[PDB]
Nucleic acid binder design. Structure first.
Lengths: 154, 48, 102, 145, 116, 49, 112
RNA sequence: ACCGAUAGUGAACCAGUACCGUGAGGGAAAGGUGAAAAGCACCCCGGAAGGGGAGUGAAAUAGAACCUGAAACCGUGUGCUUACAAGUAGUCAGAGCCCGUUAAUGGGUGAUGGCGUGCCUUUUGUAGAAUGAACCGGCGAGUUACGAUUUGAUGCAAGGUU
RNA sequence: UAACUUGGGAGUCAGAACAUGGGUGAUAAGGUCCGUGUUCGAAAGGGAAACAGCCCAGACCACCAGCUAAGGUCCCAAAAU
RNA sequence: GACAAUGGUAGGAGAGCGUUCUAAGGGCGUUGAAGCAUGAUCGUAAGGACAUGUGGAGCGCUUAGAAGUGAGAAUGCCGGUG
């Protein structure tokens, strides 16, 4: 009511017209508006204890290990970015449609050669979260990233 | 002064059953023309 | 030629050949259900049961384990914000008398 | 809704009876006749159609009134006009129109529905022992105790 | 997100207008007056399922009483003596013997009559 | 888990009581307030103590 | 075969036009002209103009015998109204409904 | 995990604009042809509007009020009913007359019988002659933030937490 | 077969009639104010002609089964002229 | 398998049905989506289908999220229409 334009005028008088008691042209039963309890701009984020974040991330990639969706390889050696070549890498070793490649530090040529295939996501070992681990059907970590996620998660 | 109740669709149609209209005279003009009104002299499209 | 069987919690006036509707028995379809409680046999020779006729079964074949038509059970109170709506299909059996005894 | 005989047209046969009314008290005669008209002496009785048969009351001027209710027992009647209340004693109806004395006793023992008005149409009361209905062939009916 | 009142108000109101078929004029067209009549008629249907069991036992006794006075019996003395005989037949089955098989009703009258 | 087969822990989540929606919820007309008085108005009631 | 004509948004109100339109329906096409020429209602030159138009669509478009035709259907539907106001007393207007009609007559010879 | 044209800015539209007020000031309603305008050449009725053909188009009850077109309301047809009857308009019980289904101990109608004084809100108590609603449609009311306390759940625990 | 304690959440502080013990009034009130019950309130069903509070009796839902309570049994209108 | 319970207003507790949106999965659509209309279908309920018309592009389902989430009443508001 306080935000819609107009409506300071009481629209008619309180007694004696035969019509209902209305107080402004912009009351919430009027057509012109005034919303009662609608959306307000708020923030939806919240937090867990940070021992409960390590355990949720260990449980997301132990579910990958127990269902054999963990394929550790050696280093990716891409000089130039080439999406056609990286798609053949994911077919010589058999992978499902959604795959999550993980390197230790940021490899700029893997993150470009896999950027365009629908279903594939490149992630730093530092940048693993629960929602792209559990979105993928299979991990493909490297040697340097498997040792890195082992040190920081345990 | 004012109607205490609305009249229904049934009660309204029972009232206006005598709200009708009659067919008129319709006698032929034997000299020439179409049907004239009975006991009337024609003006147009007839010889009465 | 004429019998009164007792079945369910009530009594049925049966003749041989007709399709009768009884509250639900624990038989399957296509079976033969014999009625054990005959109270009155008439027709030509009239045998009045003492409470029963002491014998005199009625065999009948079973058709159509079924559910009845849905009735909606709606009851409300006049000013008090309290009503209840529920539905009901009642089970039945459609037997067919085919042989009488006395 | 298993099996109950519900009577019908092409299913009921209404016969004709004659009740001699000499030496009969009014509402004991009238109550027995009221259950012949409705059909409650029939085993094929349904309440919603007109089972029940015809009654002729043939004497009707020889009706007993016990007590003092031929000078008492005024019959009242209002004319739907202001102060239009009108009365006649039971003895004055016995000597003058005794047919309406009896056929208002019996029609008052009948329901006021559309069926009870047509069940009262089956009653033919005559003052003095001659009725015209020899074509309809009625029987004698003796009243029960 | 905003959810508007689309398509669920009619679907709830049409199946009350459809459930009110055969009512006088306004009471099968308009929602507010047919809703009240369907609530009224569900209350009547509950009530009259309980009274159909009363009004048919009332019908059977009237026919047993009229069939027993053709044998010089009352309804009261018939089913007194028919219980002293041990007969466990209904008012319904006894009302259907008396219409269909007139001799079989007369043979259980003379079993109740000598039971007194 | 999977993002299409994930389910919460048992007893963790209840749905909240929407109040003022129809007869059969038990909080429909008067909405848990009772009929009248200061406690039945919006913003009404009185301060603690 | 049937032949029809309509007249949409005729400023005569639907109640006033259905009076004279009840006089001519079911009747043959020759005498329906004579009824519409002799009733002194306002609608009688308008339905007659539509009955002329449907007898002309029978002879021309469908090649019927216009001498033996009968008016099957003769109805008038509601059209869009023109909502006018009217100043009565003490600053108080009242609405006047300028109703319109869709007049429709169809004509046939009853054969298929 | 904002709105979809009564929403979202008052304003999706030649809006602070018609309009109202002496003035400050108040203040609207009003989106949708089709892919493409190919937007109906000609013929007929008519003064014209309108129609009926023809024609375009996948579609013209897509014809410029033009996407779908719901109810109120207005009609025209009908199958069954109704002119001795007292009615909260049904509801059970039912003959008759029609009809044939998401085929199931079917559908429409109802001679007649039994029962039966709307719904809310208010009240000790309302058929109430107490209040509210002409009808239909849309809109229209326990929300959010922060804190507190309780449970529920889950961490790990003499520690737990940023 | 409950009771108690602790905790979360309440709604109510306008009651009514009968019967009974009382005050008040007028051994007046469908009055009023208390004690005591029951019912209504928030309880439909049956009876009291109709009739919140009286009488009988507490409705999970089908049944065209039976017995019964208060009440009743010539006709209306079930059952004893 | 026995046995027991199940009138109910303020009010307390529980379990649900639909609505729009999101996420993931799996789908359906000019061989006609959503709507709309009709039907004698199913579920204890809120409800769910199916068929056939109309309609001419979207929409289900599963699981889990979020809420502008459910109307018959306010001498409600705005539209139509008596």
């Amino acid at each position: 009511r306080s935000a819609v334009s107009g409506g300071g005028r009481k629209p008619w008088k309180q007694k004696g017209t035969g019509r209902a008691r209305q107080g402004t042209i912009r009351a919430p039963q009027w057509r012109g508006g005034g919303i009662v309890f609608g959306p307000t701009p708020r923030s939806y984020a919240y937090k867990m204890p940070k021992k409960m974040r390590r355990l949720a991330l260990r449980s997301a990639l132990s579910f990958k290990a127990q269902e054999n969706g963990l394929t550790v390889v050696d280093a990716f050696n891409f000089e130039a970015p080439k999406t056609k070549e990286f798609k053949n890498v994911l077919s010589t070793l058999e992978q499902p449609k959604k795959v999550l490649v993980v390197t230790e530090n940021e490899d700029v040529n893997v993150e470009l050669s896999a950027r365009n295939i629908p279903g594939v996501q490149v992630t730093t070992a530092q940048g693993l979260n629960v929602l792209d681990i559990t979105n993928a059907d299979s991990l493909v970590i490297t040697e340097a990233a498997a040792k890195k996620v082992e040190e920081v998660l345990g | 002064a004012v109607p205490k109740r609305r009249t229904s669709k049934t009660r309204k149609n029972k009232r206006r059953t005598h709200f009708k209209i009659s067919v008129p005279g319709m006698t032929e003009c034997p000299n020439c023309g179409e049907y004239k009104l009975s006991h009337r002299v024609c003006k147009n499209c007839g010889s009465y | 030629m004429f019998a009164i069987i007792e079945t369910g919690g009530k009594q049925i006036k049966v003749e041989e050949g007709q399709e009768i509707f009884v509250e639900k028995l624990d038989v399957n379809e296509g079976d033969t259900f014999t009625f054990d409680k005959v109270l009155f046999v008439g027709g030509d020779s009239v045998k009045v049961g003492a409470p029963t006729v002491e014998g005199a079964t009625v065999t009948a074949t079973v058709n159509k384990q079924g559910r009845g038509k849905k009735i909606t059970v709606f009851t409300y109170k006049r000013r008090k914000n309290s009503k209840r709506k529920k539905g009901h299909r009642q089970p039945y059996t459609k037997l067919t008398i085919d042989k009488i005894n006395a | 809704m298993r099996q109950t005989f519900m009577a019908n047209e092409s299913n009921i046969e209404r016969k004709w009876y004659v009740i001699d009314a000499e030496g009969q008290t009014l509402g004991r005669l009238s109550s027995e006749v009221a259950s012949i008209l409705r059909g409650k002496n029939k085993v094929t009785y349904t309440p919603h159609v007109d089972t029940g048969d015809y009654v002729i009351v043939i004497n009707a001027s020889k009706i007993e009134f016990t007590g003092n209710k031929e000078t008492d027992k005024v019959y009242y009647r209002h004319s739907n006009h202001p102060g239009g209340i009108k009365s006649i004693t039971a003895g004055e109806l016995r000597r003058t129109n005794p047919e309406r004395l009896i056929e208002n006793s019996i029609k008052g023992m009948l329901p006021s529905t559309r069926l009870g008005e047509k069940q009262g149409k089956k009653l033919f009361v005559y003052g003095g022992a001659e009725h015209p209905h020899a074509a309809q062939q009625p029987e004698n009916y003796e009243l029960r105790g | 997100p905003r959810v508007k009142g689309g398509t669920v108000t009619r679907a709830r109101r049409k199946k009350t207008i459809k459930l009110a078929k055969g009512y006088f004029g306004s009471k099968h067209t308009l929602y507010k007056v047919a809703k009240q009549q369907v609530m009224k008629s569900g209350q009547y249907a509950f009530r009259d399922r309980r009274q159909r069991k009363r009004d048919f036992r009332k019908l059977w006794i009237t026919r047993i009483n009229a069939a027993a006075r053709q044998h010089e019996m009352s309804y009261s003395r018939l089913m007194n003596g028919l219980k002293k005989a041990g007969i466990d037949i209904n008012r319904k089955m006894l009302s259907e013997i008396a219409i269909s098989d007139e001799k079989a009703f007369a043979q259980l009258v003379t079993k109740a009559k000598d039971a007194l | 888990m999977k993002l299409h087969e994930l389910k919460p822990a048992e007893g963790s989540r209840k749905e909240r009581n929407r109040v003022g929606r129809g007869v059969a919820t038990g909080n429909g007309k008067t909405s848990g307030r009772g009929h009248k008085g200061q406690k039945a108005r919006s913003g009404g009631g009185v301060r603690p103590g | 075969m049937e032949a029809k004509a309509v007249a949409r948004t005729i400023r005569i109100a639907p109640r006033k036009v259905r009076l004279v339109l009840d006089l001519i329906r079911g009747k043959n096409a020759a005498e329906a002209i004579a009824i519409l020429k002799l009733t002194n209602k306002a609608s009688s030159p308008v339905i007659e103009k539509v009955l002329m138009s449907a007898l002309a669509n029978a002879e021309h478009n469908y090649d019927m015998n216009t001498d033996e035709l009968v008016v099957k259907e003769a109805y008038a539907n509601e059209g869009p109204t023109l909502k006018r106001f009217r100043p009565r007393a003490q600053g108080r207007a009242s609405a006047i409904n300028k109703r319109t009609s869709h007049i429709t007559i169809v004509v046939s010879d009853g054969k298929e």
